[PDB]
Paper text:
Here we describe the first crystal structure of a beta‐1,4‐endoglucanase from a brown‐rot fungus, Gloeophyllum trabeum GtCel45A, which belongs to subfamily C of glycoside hydrolase family 45 (GH45). The enzyme consists of a single catalytic module folded into a six‐stranded double‐psi beta‐barrel domain surrounded by long loops.
The structure is refined at 1.30 Å resolution and R free 0.18. Surprisingly though, initial hydrolysis of barley beta‐glucan was almost twice as fast in GtCel45A as compared to PcCel45A.
Numbering used by the authors: 5 to 183
Write the structure that this text describes.
Amino acid sequence: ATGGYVQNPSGSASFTMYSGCGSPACGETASGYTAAMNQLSFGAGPGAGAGDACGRCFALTGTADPYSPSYTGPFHTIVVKVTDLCPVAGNQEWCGQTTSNPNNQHGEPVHFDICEDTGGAGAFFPSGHGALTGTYREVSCSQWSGSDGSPLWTGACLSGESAANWPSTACGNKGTAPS
């Protein structure tokens, strides 16, 4: 996509959880399940505002535990709305994908950090299994439950929630992908 960001509607991803998404990079929260996406797919660097992932909805499916290969389940599928950025500089292990090294250390090209604040992390991760790998696919936000918060600053954007799936432009990417 423009800027060199990697924005495919479906593929492989890794998954973790985080707490604290009340001031997210898209500038607007949501009450349903939400996630941060690694910088190279989010479409903006830290402090740059909303990237083109903002507001888009994705079905996330766990398929493996990277710390226990023998674990065969149970896993879950949830639908999240992306509201936030998982930056290279703050989380290299999972979100360090760059144009020069497009996979994270766990071998995945995309990462979703699922927010605990609104329950998505508990819906997705079995207790005792807080990091997973699996798949993602962009879906209609009709499959997502919840409602959006109020914009935190001028430029806040979740307009990906009504856009056609990637490849396409809703909020738009900002700047250039991390190198």
